[PDB]
């Protein structure tokens, strides 16, 4: 039925008994580069089962006060097994994804989470200096980031944070959040479903790019209807994020990249 599914990729399987169908972004399933759209001339590496499998990133907790969370792809998976290895050993890389967000509660809980997949999800910074966010802050990895309820300008001139300041109702980029529904999405309304499943093809203005310099997709999760339970002002339910890269192919092998951190 629309509600029961099983996803198998490599050596990993995911089962769900409360789905609300699955979304295939823009109606496009991920695919490899065709010869007619090929650019780099060298033989690509395609790890296949070693990289195209389900990786579970860290679990976040939803509370009445949560504003939202965000992650960047392939960034969030840079340290994930052999996918991360191939990402850093190659100059160029390409991949699609199957994003599976998990969140179960009970029949006496309420709340709705909007799960959006955004191509080129550029976020707003914290200073008066334009495009000032530094690489280390823009790429948090598997832990991702969070949305805020208001904009707060960083004034420390001696030691600028050079970080993002994504305000939730402004979708972290100066647009109204209610219009974010034009992007592939699903809603995890506690009275209806457990999860949200989105299949994302590779989207870019090029056939292949640098995975370290460029993040193709952004995953934004916003509480559309806040978490509430029985009468417990105190309520916490975890949100686990499991993502699997698809049709990975890398070009331009050399020595490994070791990016600067923190």
């Amino acid at each position: 039925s629309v509600r029961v599914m099983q996803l198998t990729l490599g050596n990993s399987t995911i089962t769900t008994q409360e789905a609300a169908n699955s979304v295939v972004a823009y109606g496009r399933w991920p695919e490899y580069i065709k010869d007619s759209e090929a650019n780099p001339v060298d033989q690509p590496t395609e790890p296949d089962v070693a990289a195209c499998r389900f990786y579970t990133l860290d679990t976040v907790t939803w509370r009445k006060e949560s504003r939202g969370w965000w992650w960047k792809l392939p960034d969030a998976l840079k340290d994930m097994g052999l996918f991360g290895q191939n990402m850093f050993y190659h100059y160029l890389g390409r991949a699609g994804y199957t994003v599976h967000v998990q969140c179960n509660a009970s029949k006496f809980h309420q709340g709705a989470l909007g799960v959006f997949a955004v191509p080129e999800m550029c976020l707003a910074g914290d200073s008066t200096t334009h495009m000032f966010t530094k690489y280390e802050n823009a790429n948090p990895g598997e832990k991702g980031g969070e949305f805020k309820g208001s904009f707060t300008l960083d004034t420390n001139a001696t030691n600028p944070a050079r970080n993002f300041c994504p305000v939730d109702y402004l979708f972290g980029s100066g647009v109204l959040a209610g219009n974010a529904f034009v992007y592939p999405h699903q809603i995890i309304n506690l009275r209806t479903n457990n999860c949200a499943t989105l299949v994302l093809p590779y989207v870019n203005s090029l056939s292949i790019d640098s995975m370290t310099k460029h993040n193709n997709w952004g995953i934004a999760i916003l509480p559309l209807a806040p978490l509430d339970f029985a009468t417990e002002s105190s309520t916490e339910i975890p949100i686990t994020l499991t993502i699997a890269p698809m049709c990975c192919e890398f070009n331009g092998l050399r020595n490994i990249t070791v990016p600067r951190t923190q």
Partner: protein, 272 residues
Amino acid sequence: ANNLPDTQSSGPAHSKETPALTAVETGATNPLVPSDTVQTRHVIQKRTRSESTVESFFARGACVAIIEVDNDSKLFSVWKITYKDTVQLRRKLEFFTYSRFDMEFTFVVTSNYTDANNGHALNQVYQIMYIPPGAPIPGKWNDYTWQTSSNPSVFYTYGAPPARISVPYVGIANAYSHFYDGFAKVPLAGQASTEGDSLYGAASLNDFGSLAVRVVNDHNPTKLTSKIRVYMKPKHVRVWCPRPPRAVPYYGPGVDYKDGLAPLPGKGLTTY
């Protein structure tokens, strides 16, 4: 101006054929492609060399002269036709030894009052007369030579779109020579040193003649100056014998050099 070949997929090798090894002493360049030294994938090539054709490389109007006339002998000026008065077009032409093409000349004319608060003049008309080598050159801005009964003239009204005319291939040889390793005279044994001496690399003393420019209106005591910028574009181009481009500053009409003889910067041998 066409397509480039596709990249064919290439796998591993273990053979007695070694395209990587060669011997440049022969004077030939090793025609290798990526698949000769690495494993390649099949790529359908869609890039073309449409913009690097000899025609597209020269298909631009380049400035070759700025003729100036002061409508208060300066009432008229004469410019000896050449492409060596400027450096940009000259350097591009000199990538080749010989050339053959037609020419398109566009004239951009500007004028202004020298005085911010003095004088006035009605709209000016200019006459650009071509004086082929041999024809009488004007001595005054208004002598008989300006009747142009045979010389081609162009009358330009100030403010009108730039004037433009086309000239056929006018060389007396089968192609224009960008380089001429010789003289126009051979000094003979016995003659005075003053005799038989000529410039090295020069052909005719007057190759293509010159342009005589003047303002046709009667000059008013007002101080005015006009400038005619000449733009030339080679069209229907054919070129022969490539040469390395000019690396140091030009020093005259010849290949002479003097000043910027150290064009390259310093860089460590093992510095990326």
